[PDB]
Symmetry: C2
Subunit: 311 residues, 2 copies
């Protein structure tokens, strides 16, 4: 089983998937907005450095999304939450043959974003534990092995699941169907909606958050609302499990001295992902008649902080 | 007998001015204060009062630290700040056994509840005043203009002689009247403070910067709609809309655009804030009256975390 495949968002992860899929016999296009990266791949090849320190160079097709004139059987989306709508907009002409759209992007309002651009029954969500590092333009460094877990958004109308799994497995990507993928993405969004958001508001690192005398109340306030919205959305969720995971980050040997991504975003005057974290639970809670006053307020506070940071 | 034995508890600018006037009117006055330089200066060289014409007037006054006080009184007038008030009353415990009138003119809004833990609530009277006074230094105030006081008994059907208290204040030229809009006025101010202080502190911004926010109205409503709901349950007059217009009036540079409110300066100096007597007080009272206050409760927690971080 082969497909014609587009990797939309060709960072570390996308580039690694692309090489493996091409080497397996699939036709692959890497789609990305970073010019240096797209140019380097086309001009000097994509460098893949393995554990033994050997540099492997692959001939790959890379394009900016507006330049893409081909159409595909499958789009694999790695583009971040906030860039995803623009990317799909630029690919409008590409989408008219109604491809499978597999989102492996981190974060949690990705389905809803994708729904504005393609019929929801062609959407599949996924997680993966494959890893990859972006060393520079046209250069990744890779190690270890991995797997992918997949869940159709509309299982009773998605015809292509078997084909999708066969194609990914034939490339050695180790994919399987599972019903708890959306739950896993929610669980991660729970952790992110406590640690990113509070660290940003307080200008502190993860250990300093965990040293707060009211860290448990702050965490519960957010997560009890997550739990209520997940319940109404019929997505498995455990506030208690997310809490244990958060607390596991506190020690210096894990993430005690790390500032999370939203904190760095704020520090660099970049717009944060708040509307895909606390803001998404608030918006979805609104739609399901579940009160989310804490998450709604935290979202507003972050928006105000962003506005002040660009004075 | 216009002649009362009076203690001024909290003898900053305002208390010192009240005290001098009440002493000069024929009352026996004790100034009670925690600032040693001030207490020493008053006892050693008198209280200096500088008037508009620049003339320095010096009065002989009695000042003590609360711990030292053994006298008893007919009236305590409280100016002590929300957060210091419990400690002050604690230190005066032996003094309070003759059940004095307690008149609180302190700014802020959980003062009655604090006082209730030390004296029966029916001896409590709340007040506002527009007398002004400036604290120039230890034992030295500068004063201007005239003023008035509005007074409201906390338990009007059990407070016997409000008229006597007014007679004593007025014989000293303080221009007091009975009114029943005082508690509402305190709530109104607590409303303004719970928006401007708290958000400016969280955002490290000034009042104009807050007003320039594209979501200033939502942030203000979130707090004030809860205030309105708790005031309603407490049967205290409150208007979110009027408080909102007052807040908005502060934004221009010509008013308070470039000022940082008191809580912001407190945070900047690693001082504990008055959050538990602002957003924290509405949250606690809302809890007691079964009114949800999730926004004010969270804002309170955020400010507590910020205080903790500021002392690393």
């Amino acid at each position: 089983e082969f497909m014609k495949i587009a990797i939309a968002g060709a960072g570390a992860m996308g580039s690694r998937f692309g090489v493996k899929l091409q080497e397996a016999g699939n036709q692959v296009t890497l789609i990305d907005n970073w010019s240096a990266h797209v140019d380097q791949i086309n001009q000097a090849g994509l460098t893949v450095t393995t554990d033994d320190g050997v540099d492997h160079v692959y001939t790959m097709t890379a394009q900016h999304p507006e330049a893409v004139t081909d159409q595909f059987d499958l789009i694999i989306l790695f583009t971040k939450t906030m860039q995803m709508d623009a990317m799909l907009q630029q690919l409008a002409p590409v989408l008219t043959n109604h491809p499978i759209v597999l989102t492996l992007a981190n974060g949690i309002g990705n389905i809803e974003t994708i729904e504005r651009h393609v019929p929801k029954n062609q959407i599949v969500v996924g997680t993966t534990v494959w890893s990859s590092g972006l060393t520079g333009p046209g250069h990744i460094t890779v190690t270890g092995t991995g797997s992918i877990s997949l869940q159709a958004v509309v299982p009773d109308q998605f015809p292509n699941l078997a084909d999708l799994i066969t194609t990914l497995n034939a490339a050695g990507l180790n994919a399987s169907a599972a019903d708890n993928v959306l739950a896993a993405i929610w669980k991660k969004a729970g952790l992110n909606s406590v640690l990113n958001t509070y660290c940003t508001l307080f200008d502190c690192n993860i250990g300093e958050f965990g040293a707060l005398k009211n860290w448990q109340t702050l965490t519960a306030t957010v997560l009890d609302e997550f739990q209520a919205v997940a319940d109404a959305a019929q997505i498995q969720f455990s506030a208690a499990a997310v809490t244990d995971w958060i607390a596991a980050q506190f020690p210096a040997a894990v993430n005690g001295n790390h500032y999370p991504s939203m904190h760095q975003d704020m520090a660099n005057q970049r717009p944060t992902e708040i509307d895909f974290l606390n803001g998404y639970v608030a918006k979805l809670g609104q739609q399901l008649h579940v009160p989310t006053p804490a998450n709604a307020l935290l979202t507003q506070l972050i928006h105000s902080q962003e506005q002040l940071k660009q004075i």
